[PDB]
Amino acid sequence: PRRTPQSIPYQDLPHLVNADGQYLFCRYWAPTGTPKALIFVSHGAGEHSGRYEELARMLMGLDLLVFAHDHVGHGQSEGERMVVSDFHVFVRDVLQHVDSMQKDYPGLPVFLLGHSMGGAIAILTAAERPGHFAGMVLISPLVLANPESATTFKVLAAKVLNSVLPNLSSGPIDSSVLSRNKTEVDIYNSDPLICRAGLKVCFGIQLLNAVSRVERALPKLTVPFLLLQGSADRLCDSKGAYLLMELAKSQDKTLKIYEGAYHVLHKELPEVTNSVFHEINMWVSQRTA
Numbered sequence: 001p002r003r004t005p006q007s008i009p010y011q012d013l014p015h016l017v018n019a020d021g022q023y024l025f026c027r028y029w030a031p032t033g034t035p036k037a038l039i040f041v042s043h044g045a046g047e048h049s050g051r052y053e054e055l056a057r058m059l060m061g062l063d064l065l066v067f068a069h070d071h072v073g074h075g076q077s078e079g080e081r082m083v084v085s086d087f088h089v090f091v092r093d094v095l096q097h098v099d100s101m102q103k104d105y106p107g108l109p110v111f112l113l114g115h116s117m118g119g120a121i122a123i124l125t126a127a128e129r130p131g132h133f134a135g136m137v138l139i140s141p142l143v144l145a146n147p148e149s150a151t152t153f154k155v156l157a158a159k160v161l162n163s164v165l166p167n168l169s170s171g172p173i174d175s176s177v178l179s180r181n182k183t184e185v186d187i188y189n190s191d192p193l194i195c196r197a198g199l200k201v202c203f204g205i206q207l208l209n210a211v212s213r214v215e216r217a218l219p220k221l222t223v224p225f226l227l228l229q230g231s232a233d234r235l236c237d238s239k240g241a242y243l244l245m246e247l248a249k250s251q252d253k254t255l256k257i258y259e260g261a262y263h264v265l266h267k268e269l270p271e272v273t274n275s276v277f278h279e280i281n282m283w284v285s286q287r288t289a
């Protein structure tokens with residue numbers, strides 16, 4: 001019996017098998033009646049789909065069918081943890097899931113919501129299907145990395161590759177600098193489905209590939225979007241938010257900057273998180289009326 005990394009049989013769980021034969025754990029939040037639209041939620045590196053429960057419940061309350069999976073190497077899905085052969089695998093697997101849901105609900109508009117790496121995945125998914133998605137909501141998407149961090153990582157990756165240095169990775173995710181809400185930090189840290197290990201050089205290289213590919217995709221993007229960004233984001237530099245506003249060709253694009261807020265806006269201080277939920281609710285409501 002194929003089992004999750006936590007030893008639970010997939011036969012008992014919602015799942016999909018991707019093109020590489022790997023089982024991905026799925027999550028669904030369906031309203032009681034006919035949905036007005038579909039929305040795929042794309043989580044970031046080191047986390048998983050269960051971290052979106054409250055956002056998904058809000059969106060389902062707007063009569064959308066919300067759906068997600070754990071990206072390969074994450075959460076309850078198969079794969080070596082926080083490894084991917086090529087970043088495109090994530091996008092391919094999103095497109096499989098979206099295509100399979102759309103055929104079950106033909107004619108319904110489909111939105112994307114993504115955070116951080118999951119925002120880069122959203123951008124690249126929309127760009128691979130020009131004109132197809134109804135909208136995207138991006139919470140601190142990975143567009144430009146913090147320049148000092150990116151340089152540090154490139155130097156590390158070069159040392160590791162050009163001197164074959166062993167047992168060296170980049171640092172782990174530091175949740176304490178990614179939200180001001182200490183309670184949320186503690187909740188995240190004790191989640192059994194996150195990855196707390198150092199980021200491997202091979203995965204970092206794929207995140208740099210994502211950044212490069214995002215920049216090439218931006219001038220091609222036409223999908224409507226809402227972009228939410230914290231000014232004190234230590235991971236996804238706010239300069240990237242401005243680059244997305246500048247280069248996307250979308251006729252419907254809006255940016256809200258949260259002054260002083262850190263990266264994880266949907267798990268931030270209550271004044272910020274409450275606003276984030278409100279803004280997403282209004283923006284999606286207006287576009288599914």
Ligand SMILES: O=C(c1ccc2nc(C3CCCCC3)oc2c1)N1CC(N2CCN(c3ncccn3)CC2)C1
Nearest residue numbers: 044045116117145149150153175179184185188207267
């Ligand atoms: O997608 C990411 C992520 C993680 C690590 C990264 N490193 C880079 C750069 C580094 C330089 C080279 C180019 C790539 O980009 C990343 C993106 N995620 C999702 C985010 N996490 C943070 C922790 N979280 C959290 N923290 C506190 C409270 C609640 N949740 C959940 C979401 C981080």
